[model samples]
Target: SASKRAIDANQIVNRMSLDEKLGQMLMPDFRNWQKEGESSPQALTKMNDEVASLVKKYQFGGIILFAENVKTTKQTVQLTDDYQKASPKIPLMLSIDQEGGIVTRLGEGTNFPGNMALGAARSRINAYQTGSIIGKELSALGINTDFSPVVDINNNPDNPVIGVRSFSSNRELTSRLGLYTMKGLQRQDIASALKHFPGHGDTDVDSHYGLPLVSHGQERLREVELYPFQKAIDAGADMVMTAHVQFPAFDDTTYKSKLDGSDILVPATLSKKVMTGLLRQEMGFNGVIVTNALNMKAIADHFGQEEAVVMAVKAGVDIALMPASVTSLKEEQKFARVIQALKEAVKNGDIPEQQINNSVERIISLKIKRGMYPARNSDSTKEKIAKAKKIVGSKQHLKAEKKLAEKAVTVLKNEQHTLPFKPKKGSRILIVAPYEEQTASIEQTIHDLIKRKKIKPVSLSKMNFASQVFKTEHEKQVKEADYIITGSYVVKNDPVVNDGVIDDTISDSSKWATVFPRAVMKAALQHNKPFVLMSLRNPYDAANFEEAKALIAVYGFKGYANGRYLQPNIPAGVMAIFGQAKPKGTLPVDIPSVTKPGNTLYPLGYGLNIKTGRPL
Candidate 1:
């Protein structure tokens, strides 16, 4: 029955016209079509009728499901199944980008652990196990596509986009882990797409805003950037999403242009010379090649839609992903216009029918393999789904997250080796947290550990350095305290340009919200006591307090996530738990660039060059 069904699907694809074939290769977001303004029963029926009409008429290859449109696991399965039943030969590939760690699509499906905590663990097995957990939840949702197992090898510490998302800094480690991740997801029959290909990790710019340039040569790309993609592809990755970065060194062709008296640099996705000639012909990647958001400024600023569509196809992209404008137009008007355009292009012999068939066959074959042809009811096995969800947010994963936070906490330095704060059992302690709001919670984390250790914990909130408002009552308590355990917060601020000239009080107030690391470091240094600076926000604060006797960073100071990272470190003696003596290990993600130390150089002739030999 399977073989016969597959054959029938192939025959159906064979009989479809060129326009129909193109229609099958595209996917569109359908979130707003679910519910109308009025939430009454009458409005619901109207909206459902409108959505059903579109699905039946267009017969799109897939619908990328989002939380807004989907009601429940059962309802989504029924909805996709109903559309498949409308046309027996063509079944929809329901897709979702369900990568865990904050970028979750389905809110209720699964709450999986993030990559930063997992990558900071003792082994890469944590990452692999997490991927398996993600795959199971997706398959249970009646969804096959998961645009995840992010393979970008992040080396830049200040990269805004890739931090906390990449597996590790090492290229080999990234590839090895990525390979295992791809296998784990694909093992559950979930299609995996390795994204931001040619890499988007190094640049400080976001591709959503403008074009980013990756001047890394082909050899460097092959070594670091392309390594994971190659390894992932070999491990049977289902798809590869192209990056919007421009590679000047990799763009080998030389051409002349009259406009600017310079040669035009072709975008890699639109350049058949790069996407087809280099990526396919040279690199030997034959899988389905997909583009990043075509509507993004990185691609849109350089090329038009019709030109982009034809060139992307010519460049060997099988899918034009997230072309929001195309799908936003009325389906009847848009489809007719696209069909006419393609037909005219083919008449002019710009795009060949055989080229169109190559992509069509690949897509159809992938669908048949996914069991979408004459689609059997692969609805969510709710029992299995629940069991798999238990794997995430379980005692094991939570324990792993806690243990990682402990290992990641770095003690920058100690004067006179005053660490291992071996004070008497009933010693009076002063606890100071940078954020007044977090004081109650940070105290809780410390109290829990102290209670477990059978040590009495005391706070000096009424005192000088500990409290925001310095008071005589608090100062008396601090004077009587046997030991001071000052907990300071790291405040991040924007680099002010020409401080006196620019009246940026509002901008500075809005931007500089957190506790400054420098302020904490200064408070600790001024005390001349064994101060413990614990950051409840970012672990990177350890770098700033190099002179601290007891410096600690938990990556987060949340009452819950902090308790996990901090509790273990407090009991075992941070260095003893992780078995580290010094602070040589680096933070998993790069801290923001403003945190990097630099000096302002004032030159003798720094102000300006006088055009007429007159100083302003």
Candidate 2:
């Protein structure tokens, strides 16, 4: 307690002019305030200059950076120092979207596996590894803040955005992973903004496009989505970002529903009743509240400039992210506007200045906790690289990946004993892989298998009747082959989302494609030979493989390779016994299950049945 400053932080802020105090509240986007290709010539120099200017002119609060703000690791560190030195105050809050998996922006740090893969990996150790990698990377990069460890319960199978981003659908798993991720991050002196609070799971909409709503009542929210947040709070998360969606079930007397009375829900960011009354008062979240990006369509679609900020500030959010016009606004002018708005609101007695002070105190405490007042100690780029190397592609990590891949690859069916391809000579093997003819993973896998089996590799796409090949002379090579194996890399159509709305009636029509199974199967049936169909996309591709002599689902084969599955035999038997020997796991957030529609659910328990059927 003695380590805390005795002087009043509010007194220091209040002693400043309106513009300076306002500056203390402003956080401009560094991504927008940069020059073209400037990141390359000391990638962050231009931003550093801009931040220096903004700091002197506006006395701004923080800076948010994306991939463009960084070039090499060294450049990122230099940028952080440059901006902090530009302002006389503590270091600027350097924030990034380090929410691992597909949404990672700080690529140089850690290529941690996504939430789905992490869940499947099922080891808290791996989750801790991912968090430590990210934390150390950010702290080394001169970044003090990370917008990460998405704690949302991804239970919606059809959820448009939050799918692979969450830890697991199981609440306990999410809490475990989230807490581990936060703890690991804090070890490197990098604070995390645990987010999309009040939970962004269970919704099929993307906030980037428009407002979404979680239709579940308060009870459902408590049991599933909020479970992780509660855990996160207990674990001492540095900051929490609120969602833009509405929750009707949590509505109270102060909470106002939509104007049309269509839904009892209120958007979290703009609703003082929800953000302040509900989150701050009812839930007792004393930490900082950061709003989602203001440029998002969800906020932009319904709210205007001054109106949005007024509501956001009043709603108890300390940070307004990526505001649409912050680029052009002068620091003093922006500061003046915010302070003037607050002063006017206070004079009018709308929101108490005490409330504003409470939010500011939380923000200041977080800054102090991050050692903003003290100068940053210099760290070497070589040291940073070493950390990256030690964490990114380590052997144990790769092994974890392989195990996760096996678990994620589902075996939809096996009517016959056609799989575990018998290791015999002259088995008349035929392998077919269907793609847009752009990729070679399938060809490579088959070739690898042939290489392992020490058999002559047959190229079936060459002799196909359609003659869709780039070369015409390979037909003889395929025809002379002993057995034909056909593999098609099926590309499923992306599920459509009209911003924040979900259409329960939506269905996929891949089977309708004339060239789908019809054309492929006709060729195989005509040959009167045993066939094995390998679907590289969906596990259910085995259903289509039913008509073939044998059917197999590589289980989103490409994703498995890019994320976690392994080549044959090197860890060969591992994937074969997924359910039993394989670790048990699932994504923490709601993902849109193809089996379910217009709703969300936690990931189902997955396993691999090595059983295969013989050709008819």
Candidate 3:
């Protein structure tokens, strides 16, 4: 079957024109499609004529699916089937960012614990299981590729985008976890993309909104930033996704062209030094090198669509991802312009024709290797469909999800031995949450869980972070309670300021969100009531609230799903806190402090088990 697929792919590639070869290198978002005579954005919900037009005209090598294109299992399968029917010659790379946790694209599949939780749990077998389940689910949906297992080392606590998505901050641990995740995908024959390469870990900026600069030198890059990538490559990663960040040490400056000779700074997506020199030559990565979205501001702000596409190819990128707008008409026009410009560039000697052929060869060969041959009816199709039915959110997978959640709950402090709180006959419990918007999900879940124990729980939900006045009545409520429990969801800052959300502004003093919880802890301490604090988001907030009697870091919580805001995984976390299960997680990253002398609050691999009441 492999040999047959390879022969078929080679035959298809050999007969393809230069335009078709160039088109194979671009993978656009599925959100850009529209049905004939349809103008509204909702028209992209189903497979349409515009998609067929793109396939027939450009012979696009792949289509990247998203949540917009996904509504149900049947709908996802039908969409992929329709795409396959539209393109009868080649099997498209139907891809999704099914990375699980918050980055999940499909709404129906199992929303297992994310990368940070997996890292905290520190089980390679669990990591592999998570990946295998995700792969099997995607395979059922007619999806072939997953851009997942974010191999980026999350070293910077201030990193807005890659905080919980990364496995860990430690390089070796990230590599081990990432490889197992990849192996799991490979088991299902689903191509795994190790993404945001050259590392997006230490940057403070989100590349979606702006260009991020990673200003580390070569030695530091080798040790911290590039370590996981190098290791993933050594372990045979299917693909490597480039970052949009500017790495000056790797490639400080770029010239516009050999003819123009104008100085310019370029992100890794368009940097030959990083993409070709460093990743390909230095690291010896021979697999496909895919660029991050060209529509991202990091590339969009700097270069025109055609220019960026050309530069990405020149930088040795095999695939240019999402190079056009999402709107239908604009996307069609953008694709036209890009294709025409690339053709002209080749004709004008700006781009080598041989380079286009080489990229197409790699694309065709990789697709064949992944079992993507010509589109046709096969007996195995029914078997795959049947497999999809049983594999999605299977009972075994759900059990594993709960098990990992239980293991990932880390005890940061139990100074007062306040944990393993035994429920009295009718004890009053006060649950204090920092922000009304963030805490509603956890608050309700905790209330429900505590109520199950026949405990009377009073909720003191604060609306504002900066200015909060605990009225005399609220203090009376706090004083009357037998135990005080506080929950804080202080993760990274919002990419943009909005009306209802409180931004994670940097500083121990200025960030009133952090201050608000501390105020609650102080009130509990003054009343001499044992206090329990939960860091629902970032684990770094644990050391700040050292005064709290007990501290538990769940790393992250599944806050909202679909439309309603509610904790999907609150039961497991609450159960772990009550000693229903053991807390098996360790600190995935070093918790540093601005005020401390050594700057180390909680070192990496530091964690306390609730059962044993000892460091794990």
Q: Give the worst 10-residue stretch by lDDT in candidate 3.
A: 493-502
Sort every candidate by TM-score, greatest first.
Answer: 3, 2, 1
Per-residue CA lDDT of candidate 3, range 1-616, in tens?
A: 6466456656777898888887888888767454456666662566767667777787787888878887667667778877877767777788888886667777567777688889998989989988998888887778889998798988877664587788888998998899999989978878889988899888745433246777678899899878888888898788899998888888877545332344556788888898889888989987778888887754665576668888898888889888777566545777888888878888998778877776677677777777666445573545655666687767777788778877888788887567876656466666666555445555555566666763444443433333454545666766777767666666752222235322334334455556557666777788988778877777777756756768887766555434443333444566665556678889898886534534687888988867667898
How high is the lDDT of residue 251 in model 1?
69
What are the runs in model 2 whose C-alpha is more than 4 Å off? 1-21, 33-45, 158-160, 204-209, 252-265, 328-339, 376-603, 609-616
Clashes of each: 7, 46, 0
For each candidate, what TM-score against the reference? 0.70, 0.72, 0.88
> Residue-wise lDDT of candidate 2 within 1-616, one digit each (tens)?
3145325455554555545544555566756543334432233434445446656776666777878876556566666667777875645687888776556665344444466556655667777767776776677667888888888876644453465577666888888878888888877777788878888877745433246777778788888888888887877888888888876676532232223333334577777777777777877777778888876654554565445666788777877665534443343365456556767876787767666666666766777766665565565545655554555445655565455544443333344544444434444444344432312343444455566654344443322322243122333434444545555443332333245332223223333322334344545456454445544432223333435554433323332254332232112222232112232333233323333444332224443344422111
As for lDDT, the candidate ahead, 2 or 3, is: 3
The model with the greatest lDDT is 3
lDDT comparing candidate 3 with the true structure: 0.74
For candidate 3, report its TM-score: 0.88
Candidate 1 lDDT trough over 10 residues, lowest sum: 602-611
lDDT of 2 at 363: 69
Error of 3 at 93 (Å): 0.8
lDDT of each residue in 8-126, candidate 1, tens digit only: 55677789987678767666555553234543222111125555555566566666766664445555545545545554557766676666554556534544434443444424565
